[PDB]
Amino acid sequence: MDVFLMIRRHKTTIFTDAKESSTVFELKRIVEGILKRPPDEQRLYKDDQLLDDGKTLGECGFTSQTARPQAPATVGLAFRADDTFEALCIEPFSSPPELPDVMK
Amino acid sequence: DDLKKGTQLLEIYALEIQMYTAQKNNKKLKALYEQSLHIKSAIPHPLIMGV
Amino acid sequence: MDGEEKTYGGCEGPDAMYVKLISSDGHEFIVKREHALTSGTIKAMLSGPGQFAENETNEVNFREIPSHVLSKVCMYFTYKVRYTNSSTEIPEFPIAPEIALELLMAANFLDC
Amino acid sequence: VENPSLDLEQYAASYSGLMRIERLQFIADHCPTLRVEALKMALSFVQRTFNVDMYEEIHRKLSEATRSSLRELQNAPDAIPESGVEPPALDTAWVEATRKKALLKLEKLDTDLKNYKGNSIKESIRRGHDDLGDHYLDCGDLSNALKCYSRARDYCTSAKHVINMCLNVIKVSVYLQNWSHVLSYVSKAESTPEIAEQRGERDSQTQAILTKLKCAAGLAELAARKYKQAAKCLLLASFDHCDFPELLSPSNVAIYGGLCALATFDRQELQRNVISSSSFKLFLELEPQVRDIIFKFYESKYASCLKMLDEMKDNLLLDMYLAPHVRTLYTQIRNRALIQYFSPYVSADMHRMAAAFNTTVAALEDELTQLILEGLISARVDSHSKILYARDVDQRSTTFEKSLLMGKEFQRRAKAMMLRAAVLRNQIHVKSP
After folding, report:
1. Which residue is closest to A15 within chain C, CA to CA?
2. Inter-axis angle of helices D179-186 and D209-223, nearest 10
3. D120 touches chain C (CB under 8 A)
4. Which CATH fold would you assign to the domain C17-112?
């Protein structure tokens, strides 16, 4: 039923819970109370694509099999550095270290 | 605990039993028998008690 | 489109509603407060340190856990809390061979 | 076989969701006469709350019954739905309209659920879980329906909230073939309300609570081939619920419990269970064809009790769950009637038994072979005179020899145990591998 998403922006993930087919404007109000920023400055993206305020999460592609609690989906974040978007690309996680060869 | 002879709640249910027995409807006679136990615990021994 | 939404609802909270977890590569893992109560070392930091339990400055510094290890730890906290107090299907958790050897050492440290 | 005489109004108004569609498709695939009315009523249910998984499967069977000339449905449909009634067809602009309308209803219910959680109201959250659980069933999300009912368990505060929640998990566990989960949930729903409230639902009762908990468990016990446990719980339910919106019909509990106890109980046990109990008398009075079976079985009337069994077999085969049980329950009732009939006899004639069961001499000889190996009797077939004789051994022969064989194994196993304990004394363990 419930789906979990992560808002990553320049090596900074934000774990925020939302509904399956909820409005996009409702998700921006939750980040306002944690970042002390107006919701009009944030911009949610999905696979390098600008979303709309009139649409919902269920119409884009936020299903139960995709945004599972065990493996959430990456959500883009873009602020307002001047008048347009700011961030767009993030950085992946690090690589695992060398495994001990004495155990294999 | 004074005078008796005067029951209305049990007289209505007793009149339906004499009518439903002619139509052979055991589904309604079983429901009317359970409702007669509450009134039987508050009446002496008149004539409706034997019906 | 349709449907009535709530402006100040859901899981909206101040600085005391979400915690902060500092990784070893510079990543900042900000999760909920109820999800960090599964472990033992993280829960001990919120009860202390210290005579100030709540001060809008709660943070977790992990110098031994990098970024790829804490990425599965935060997902394991949500998987453990959500899949309780119910009776539904529980899918299998995808665990990599290179991560299983690292997740075992982190589970014993976090007491989970 | 199939039966053209069957009431489809009561069989479709008893269940809802996926059970109403599956029960109607099995009738059309088995009965050629009841195929147009079965597919028409099933297509009308797709209009309310549209979907995309159950709208393309129903139309697949309609095109194979009207366009194909191999079936009898050709002179009336003429390979076109324009024949008397106008069922919903399937075109290009219909596969897209049935998907956009279903997704619009999901976004409206999901948005309202987030607002109810922010108001800190446990009554609005529990009410919204029932609407989301039944919506994902008709669409095709079998895993999303169990996630909505499982979250409503923490918002209970009364006895009616636990009963309404436990009844929803049974509907999802039926499609998943989880018979063990149904038996584990009916026990929890019986200890909280203490069996029909704490006083019996005031004085008069219109919809009994015990009947709901006793009817949902009978469907899972029948599919698991458990006729002994299903016939012992269906007798406690009474006819006081007036049909069901999402459960079995009241005209099927008398057959489910009447046919299960007829194969596991004899004649003496039937007069004390399905006859002495006043709760099962209300269910048997609705269908007089089932009450005459018990009376004919007690009066040693196996000739008339067998002819009435095959007459109702064509009507029970049109069902979905009772259809696969016509080959396991019918063979046990016929075998039980033959054992009880041969108990007072000891030298029955083959010519008299063949004329009583409406059979012949050739079919009667084959029935005696399957009655000795499978049954618990002891008869002998004498082919020299065509008379079922009886030749049993002495009571002292099968008792002295059985006790002597057990005494020899008792002394052999006791002496062999001393040999195993002998090597365990001088420090000699296992050294073979």
Report:
1. C31
2. 160
3. no
4. Potassium Channel Kv1.1; Chain A (3.30.710)
Task: Chain C: list its partners (3+ Cβ pairs within 8 Å).
Answer: A, D
Domain count of the fold of chain A:
1
Q: Cβ(C39)–Cβ(C80) under 8 Å?
A: no
Experimental technique: cryo-EM
Among the partner-chain residues D110, D141, D148, the one whose CB lies closest to the CB of A21 is D110
Which resolution in angstroms does this entry have?
Answer: 8.8
Whether A contacts B, i.e. 3 or more CB pairs less than 8 A apart, is: no
The CATH number of the domain where A10 resides is what?
Answer: 3.10.20.90
- Please indicate whether, in this complex, the C-beta atoms of A15 and C27 are within 8 angstroms of each other: no
Query: What 3 state SS string does chain D have?
Result: CCCCCCCHHHHHCCCCCHHHHHHHHHHHHHCCCCCHHHHHHHHHHCCCCCCCCCCCCHHHHHHHHHCCCCCCCCCCCCCCCCECECCCCCCHHHHCHHHHHHHHHHHHHHHHHHHHHHCCCHHHHHHHHHHHHHHHHHHCCCCHHHHHHHHHHHHCCCHHHHHHHHHHHHHHHHHCCCHHHHHHHHCHHHHCCCCCCCCCCCCCCCCCHHHHHHHHHHHHHHHCCCHHHHCCCCCCCCCCCCCCCCCCCCCCHHHHHHHHHHHHCCHHHHHHHCCCCCCCHHHHHHCHHHHHHHHHHHCCCHHHHHHHHHHCHHHHCCCCCCCCCCCCCHHHHHHHHHHHHHCCCCCCEHHHHHHHCCCCHHHHHHHHHHHHCCCCCCCEEECCCCEEECCCCCCCHHHHHHHHHHHHHHHHHHHHHHHHHHHCCCCCCCCCC
Domain that holds residue A62: 2-103
Q: Touching D: which chains, 3+ CB pairs < 8 A?
A: A, B, C
Structure token pair of residue D426: 């001088």
- Per the listing, tokens 């008339």 go with D304
CA distance D144 to chain C (A): 10
